[PDB]
Each structure stands twice: as C-alpha cells, then as structure tokens.
C-alpha cells in the first residue's frame, strides 16, 4: 500500500483522522436514500486485482454517484453530483 486518501462517513479505525492508506484508489461518493436525504462519504477503495469499477456499475442504484482518482489525497478536490431526474 502506497496511496493516501481523505476519508469521512466510514473511516477504518486505523485512521490518523481522515486518512486511510491504500494500494487501490481514493473515492468520494454521494447517495440519496428513500426520503430526499443525501449523505456524503469518502475513503479508500481497496485494490481489486484484475477487477475494477468506478463509474461503470450498471447494477448500482440510480441515486448514487461515485468518483475515483489515484493521487495522494486526490479526493479532497472531489465533489460528485447526483444526476438531475
């Protein structure tokens, strides 16, 4: 592992706060639940070997948008928006 990401919402408890180390990617996500409520989260997406998937998850719910990037702390600058309907 060699990548540092910002995290919030669900940080691994090996956090010096708002930082997880990973070998995969950094992510930020937005989702809205069954009432209009929208919650943010960010953290580490673990390296998945041959598999990888960030934007292309046709099975994922519609009211969810996630973005990925692979630079030290790249996800602070990250602001995913729900589609408009």
């Amino acid at each position, epitope marked *: 592992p060699f990548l540092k990401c910002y995290c919030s919402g669900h940080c691994p408890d090996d956090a010096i706060n708002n930082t997880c180390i990973t070998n995969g990617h950094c992510f930020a996500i937005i989702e809205e639940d*069954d009432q209009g409520e929208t919650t943010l989260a960010s953290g580490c997406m673990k390296y998945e070997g041959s598999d990888f998937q960030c934007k292309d998850s046709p*099975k994922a*719910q519609l009211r969810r948008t996630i973005e990925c990037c692979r630079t030290n702390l790249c996800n602070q600058y990250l602001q995913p928006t729900l589609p408009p309907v």
Partner: antibody
Amino acid sequence: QVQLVESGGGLVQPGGSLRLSCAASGFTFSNYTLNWVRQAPGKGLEWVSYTSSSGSLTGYADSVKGRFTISRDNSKNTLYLQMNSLRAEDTAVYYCARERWHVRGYFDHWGQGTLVTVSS
Amino acid sequence: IELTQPPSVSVAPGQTARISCSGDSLGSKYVIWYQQKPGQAPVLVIYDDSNRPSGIPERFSGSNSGNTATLTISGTQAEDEADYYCSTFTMSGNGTVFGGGTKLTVLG
C-alpha cells in the same frame, strides 16, 4: 420504509412452470436492481437472478439459465420470475431482494419469501 | 468464485465469536455478511468488507485480507444465535455468491 412481498409459489409437478411475483413499495422501484435469491429447506442461500434498474441488463445462475426468465414492470411496481422446466432441485423458498451499492453492491432489503415445492 | 465457511461455531455467553469465510484471493474482493434467524429473511449486518448498516450493534465488525474474511461478534448474547452467511460479487452471470453459511450457537 421499503417493502417487498413474494407471491405465486406453491406446488408444481416436475417439468411444470410457475410464475413468482414480488410487489415492491416504499421506494421509487425503477431506481434499483432487484434479485431473486432462494434457499432449499434448511440448506443455504443460493442466488438465482438479477435485472438492472432499467430492466435491460439481466443475469442468471448456471443452475437456472435458460429455464428461468427474470423480469420487471416498472409501471406496476412488480418484479417477476418465470420458472419453467421445474425440477426437484428447484424446491426452495424464494426471496426477492433489493440491491444497493455504497462502494459495492449489497442486498439491503428482502421479502419474506414464498415456498416453491416441486414434486410429483 | 467459491466461499468456504465452517458449518458451525459456538461461544460462551459474553465471549467473542469469530466466523471465517475463505476463498482464492478473497481479500481482493469486497465481502458482505448476512445474519439469518429461524423463520425469517436474512438481514444485512456488514457491507463493504467492514461497514455496519446504521442500526446493527457496534458488537458486529468484519475484516478481510489474504484469503480470509471474518465476522467478529464481541461480547455475544443469546439474541445473536443465528445463521451467518458471507457473500461476494461473482462475474458468473454477473451475480453474487454465498458462503455455505455457519450456525452460531451461544452455549446455554
């Protein structure tokens, strides 16, 4: 407050077909992937099938491919599973289940299943 | 492609239970855990390898590395007696795969 209710199970001979329905509510239905998952009495969970939210992507377990056709009607709020060429191995309690992703998919809400029992 | 859980695991009241789930390179896949009580639907308890849905007690945690994912129930109670299944996303036909599930007995 999500709800999911399976119906249409029951008895069938081998080679028969049944159609299972499951009625969704408490969520904007067409925004979510739905699954069929089953469980033979007192054995373990076996995943059967998914349809994407828009109904266009579809997927099956080898043990059912070609015999079962999943589908949905986003008009009603209803998910279906057409079970043909039934066998003893298909007897199981059937569950429909909603898919939801954070980073990756999980099934957050399940119906309470109908029993399908296949027997001559 | 194939998840292996021990059929049954038992603990004394109050003690920690560890339920394992193993398969080729499991630690490069995200694992999900369900608890299931007699007569009812399975219930989500852990969702990316280790997130708790709001409303599942802190008592439950999961971890995943190597070939092994683990559901850990700290100070466990009668009410925790149930079957637990692990699972993960398979690429066959683009579905999900379940462990054979394990029965947690809280020695009474």
